[PDB]
């Protein structure tokens, strides 16, 4: 350091950055047209009335949920798989993969959009859980995702066929714990080569401790609105921040990086097959 974003682009290009572990949050799925939670006016916690919310936190509380399954099951119709599409913040995680640099991408966002842009589910944490499976509420069982799909666009609340539960689809309630696969943080932080931090600050643990466990050469590259969270509370001197719209700053990497018509032809492929 004092790196630039054209440094980190080199050393990619190397390939001396190997096992890149990204993280990511609500940030990059703006462009989507899925506004963070938090967004006044546009935001899920500000709609109670379309959602027919009692107060925004009930919609994952577990509690509410099951004196009333009807408001989550309304987002769930809203986020399941092939309502929104991804962009190229998600494309360009996908050619990390393609391209075999990614070591684990650790995700806060419950759109599933990394997995629709063709990440495998073995290179994601989806931390706060997700739409493509869902488990029975009562006996535990679990069902693919698609197995209650005719439910869900319906407006019926699928039932268990062994003990007739509610099938709720795996998104973690607050309260409980994150999934099992959250802890594969434990092998895969000390072992990335470089951090990459997208549409998000990583202000609330236990993600926030994870900017720091990383080894002290590895750069952290944040490309996000601010400079903010803990980054910023606490630089290192190999950490690079590009600031502003997260589109622009993951085209302009993308560029550095020489894969424009690399990206240009996978969004062709996939927006095809979408
Ligand atoms: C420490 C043990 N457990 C925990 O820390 C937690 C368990 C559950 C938690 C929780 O917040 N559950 C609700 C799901 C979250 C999904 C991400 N989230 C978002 N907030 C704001 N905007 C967005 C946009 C999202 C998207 N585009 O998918 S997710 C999200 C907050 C609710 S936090
Ligand atoms: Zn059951």
Redesign the pocket.
């Known amino acids: 350091g004092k790196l630039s974003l054209q440094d980190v682009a080199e050393l990619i290009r190397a390939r001396a950055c190997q096992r890149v572990v990204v993280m990511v949050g609500?940030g990059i799925?703006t462009p989507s047209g899925?506004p963070?939670?938090?967004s006044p006016g546009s935001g899920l916690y500000s709609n109670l009335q379309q959602y027919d919310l009692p107060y925004p936190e009930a919609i994952?509380e577990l509690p509410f949920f099951f004196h009333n399954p009807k408001p989550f099951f309304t987002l769930a119709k809203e986020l399941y798989p092939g309502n929104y599409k991804p962009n190229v913040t998600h494309y360009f995680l996908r050619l990390l993969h393609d391209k075999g640099l990614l070591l684990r991408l650790y995700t806060?966002?419950?759109?599933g959009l990394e997995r629709v842009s063709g990440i495998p589910a073995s290179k994601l944490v989806e931390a706060?859980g997700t739409f493509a499976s869902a488990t029975c509420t009562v006996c535990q069982r679990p069902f693919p995702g698609e197995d209650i799909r005719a439910d869900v666009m319906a407006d019926r609340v699928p039932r268990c066929p062994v003990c007739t539960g509610v099938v709720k689809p795996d998104?973690?309630?607050?309260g409980?714990?994150?999934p099992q696969r959250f802890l594969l943080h434990v092998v895969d932080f000390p072992m990335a080569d470089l951090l990459l931090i997208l549409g998000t600050s990583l202000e609330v643990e236990?993600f926030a401790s994870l900017t720091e466990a990383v080894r002290s050469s590895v750069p952290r590259l944040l490309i996000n609105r601010d400079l903010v969270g803990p980054l910023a509370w606490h630089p290192r001197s190999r950490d690079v921040a590009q600031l502003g719209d997260v589109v622009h700053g993951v085209e302009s990497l993308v560029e550095l990086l020489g894969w424009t018509e690399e990206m240009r032809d996978l969004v062709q492929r996939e927006t095809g097959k979408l």
């Open positions: 609500a799925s899925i963070d939670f938090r994952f806060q966002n419950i759109d706060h998104i973690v309630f607050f409980e714990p994150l236990p």
